[model samples]
Target: QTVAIKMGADNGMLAFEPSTIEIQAGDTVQWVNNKLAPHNVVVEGQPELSHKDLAFSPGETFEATFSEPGTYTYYCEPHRGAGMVGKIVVQ
Candidate 1:
């Protein structure tokens, strides 16, 4: 399954709608940018190189497929302190 996490979604501001979720291994997280620009997804366990690209369009997106059973946290680079945070529980 591909779960949707909206940044500036539900038709609103600087936050990850829902902020948290649960999914199974092999499922994907589809980060949808419905409003903010200069946004990028920072997955805690990903390699450093992957953080360099920031999504810049209203409908732009970034995706990650979880394959491990653990808790993962992510956030938007431009809105972290403003509360654009998200969490994933994979099992």
Candidate 2:
């Protein structure tokens, strides 16, 4: 199944909503730009799984499929310092 995750919690926050998720291998995660501008997803220790392009418009999206079962941690390029991070557990 495909799950949709919000890039930013709200206009006043620089964080992702539903920061942690659990899914099966082969499931897809779709990150949508919402309530904030200029955001991107960068996976920790896995640069190849990251989407570096910033999304400035609301509703813009970046998607990734989890082919392996593991914990995938990621953060927003422009908001990591603000604690904008997320985790995905693929089982």
TM-score of the candidate numbered 2? 0.93
* Most lDDT-accurate candidate: 2
Off by over 4 Å in 2: none
CA error at residue 56 for candidate 2, angstroms: 0.4
Q: Where does the lowest 10-residue lDDT sum fall in candidate 2? A: 7-16
Error of 1 at 16 (Å): 1.0
Summarize candidate 1's per-residue lDDT along 1-91 as a digit string, tens digits: 9988777756667877768889999997888777766778787767641354777788777777888889888878778888787788898
lDDT by residue (tens digit), candidate 2, 1-91: 9999998786568888888999999999999999777899998888778999889999998898889999989999888899999999999
Each candidate structure's count of clashing pairs: 0, 0
**Whole-model lDDT values for every prediction:** 0.77, 0.89
Clashes of 2: 0
